[PDB]
């Protein structure tokens, strides 16, 4: 259950009660589509249905022809597998492995073993189930349903080609054409991972797609194979807390804690994720990619309870930009009201239920439905949870404008204090 704590001292709110799902690795699987080497239907005729088949075959052939024309690094794992498949003889390993089965584990040249699955076999359908239907002597097809089912089978290839063409062979998220939900669910079950990870990934397949990649690998020897790069969640169920920060100004000099974003416990240390796009959030599970993470000591949590703790140097910025704004946190909203701008909190039925005075203040999502700051109307999150207000004297009142260095784009508590002490030393 989610719990929010607003700290009036630093105008920051921490939304605890979350559980982690941190992507610490990648799982690369090879998805193969066996392609027919057909060039055309041999006969020519005036049948309208066969012309539709030829039109669909032209779509098929053009799709194959289109495919043949094709900090960290997010696809380094799938690119590595793709480059191995380009080596001589590695395609025939996949061809022989999937000769009698649709799933196989293939040991490549590097020694890595990758699970290979054949999700579609157009070579079988076209050569064995489509071409024998065509009466070459009359160049006619008996039933129209053959045309319709050919369009359905070929449709997945056309959409896979369509996505690779516009994404230059690397698509993210992995769509349902690359890997259907049943295939993705079965693929997760087939991964050599613990049951806790399988339960986590199966319940959140929509998050798995958003964090996955599809890499077009080979189009050679009647095989269309692309590497799907699924995420591995090695860290699960560890506590997470999101730090929401809003400007804190005198009522002038402003102060804002810059270290906002998600924090999660990881192997005795705190993984900090500054970018907002990094972490996807579910009911109470936070899916943060560790590639965009900073590893911090566990003492980083002490900045919430004590901004002047000696165990850590909390990051803040200093400026004179006394502009009113509101941060719509979970279970509430931080409202910073300054100047002549009027800030109010409103309810759907009762209307304006609170008028914010000058300073930084917090309103829970209970009762409040919208927040108005200046000319901007903010809607608050209606998540169920318990919000806690921690009253305290704002830290911005301890400084003085004469020596406050109000130009730090990114600094820390100790850096500001040392720079202040330098100002006092000169003065």
């Amino acid at each position: 259950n989610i719990t929010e704590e607003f700290y009036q001292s630093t105008c920051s709110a921490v939304s605890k009660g979350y559980l982690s799902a941190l992507r610490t690795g990648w799982y690369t699987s090879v998805i193969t589509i066996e392609l027919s080497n057909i060039k055309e239907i041999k006969c020519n005729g005036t049948d309208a249905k066969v012309k539709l088949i030829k039109q669909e075959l032209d779509k098929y052939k053009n799709a194959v022809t289109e495919l043949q024309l094709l900090v960290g690094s997010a696809i380094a794992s799938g690119v590595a597998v793709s480059k191995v498949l380009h080596l001589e003889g590695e395609v025939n390993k996949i061809k022989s492995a999937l000769l009698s089965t649709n799933k196989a584990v293939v040991s490549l040249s590097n020694g890595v073993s990758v699970l290979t699955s054949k999700v579609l076999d157009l070579k079988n359908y076209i050569d064995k189930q489509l071409l024998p239907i065509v009466n070459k002597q009359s160049c006619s097809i008996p039933n129209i349903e053959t045309v319709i089912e050919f369009q359905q089978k070929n449709n997945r290839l056309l959409e896979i080609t369509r996505e690779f063409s516009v994404n230059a062979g690397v698509t993210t998220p992995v769509s349902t054409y690359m890997l259907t939900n049943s295939e993705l669910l079965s693929l997760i079950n087939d991964m050599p991972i613990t049951n806790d990870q399988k339960k986590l990934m199966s319940n959140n397949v929509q998050i798995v797609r958003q964090q996955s990649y599809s890499i077009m690998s080979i189009i050679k020897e009647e095989v269309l194979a692309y590497v799907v790069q699924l995420p591995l969640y090695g860290v699960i169920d560890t506590p997470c807390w999101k730090l929401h920060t809003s400007p804190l100004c005198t009522t002038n000099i402003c102060l804002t804690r810059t270290d906002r974003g998600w924090y999660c416990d990881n192997a005795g240390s705190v993984s900090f994720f500054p970018q907002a796009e990094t972490c996807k959030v579910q009911s109470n599970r936070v899916f943060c990619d560790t590639m965009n993470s900073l590893t911090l000591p566990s003492e980083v949590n002490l900045c919430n309870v004590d901004i002047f703790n000696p165990k850590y140097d909390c990051k803040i910025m200093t400026s004179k930009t006394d502009v009113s704004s509101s941060v719509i946190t979970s279970l509430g909203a931080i409202v910073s009201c300054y100047g002549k701008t009027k800030c109010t909190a409103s309810n759907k039925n009762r209307g304006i239920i609170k008028t914010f005075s000058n300073g930084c203040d917090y309103v829970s999502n209970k009762g409040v439905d919208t927040v108005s700051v200046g000319n901007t109307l903010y809607y608050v999150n209606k998540q169920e949870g318990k919000s806690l207000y921690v009253k305290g004297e704002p830290i911005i009142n301890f400084y003085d404008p004469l020596v406050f260095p109000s130009d730090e784009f990114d600094a820390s508590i100790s850096q500001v204090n040392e720079k202040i002490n330098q100002s006092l030393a000169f003065i």
Epitope: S100, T101, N102, K103, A104, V105, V106, S107, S113, L115, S117, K118, V119, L120, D121, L122, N124, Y125, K128, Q129, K153, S186, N189, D190, M191, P192
Partner: antibody
Amino acid sequence: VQLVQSGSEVKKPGASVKVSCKASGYRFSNYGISWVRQAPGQGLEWMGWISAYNGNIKYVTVTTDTSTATAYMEVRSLTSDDTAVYYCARDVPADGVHFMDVWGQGTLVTV
Amino acid sequence: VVMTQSPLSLPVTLGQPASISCRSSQSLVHSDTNTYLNWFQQRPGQSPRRLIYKVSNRDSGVPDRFSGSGSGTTFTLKISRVEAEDVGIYYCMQGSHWAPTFGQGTKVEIK
């Protein structure tokens, strides 16, 4: 590529017998093992499948030892109806289609 | 998936052809257009060996006399010329569905 099983076993009802299956000629971890029962005068019957890649199990307790490339099947509460030949077949490593290309010579368990 | 197999006994004169049919209760066409139907042979005193691994694909080392045919729910195994080494029990198997199932088996003899 071959599979060799344990010798014939004679047991009394209510006991437990663990058949083994030693693999050679291929990478054990790239496949799974399917166990098939053949009662005398009766057709083949699929019992269970264990993957050497995932550890996944389908259906008696089947286990695989990757280090020794050996698969085990233990049948508990043996009855007179459990007198049959038990085969191990190399199978799909994941939830695909089963093929059972290579079979062990067969362990005759008598109860 | 019940794999009905017919006939159960197939006494065949040497050199004459033999046909074994095996009809499934459901269509064996998988999500991918393949139909994973296997044919096994159990030589007397030996473990079953795979002959045909998809409806018509002979396995490596299988003589050309063994031909597989069929589609959908009905399948056929044919031997062009029955020799002394063709005596055995033949099982059709499907691996497409969750649980592999075998046929009742066909006992081929010599008249």
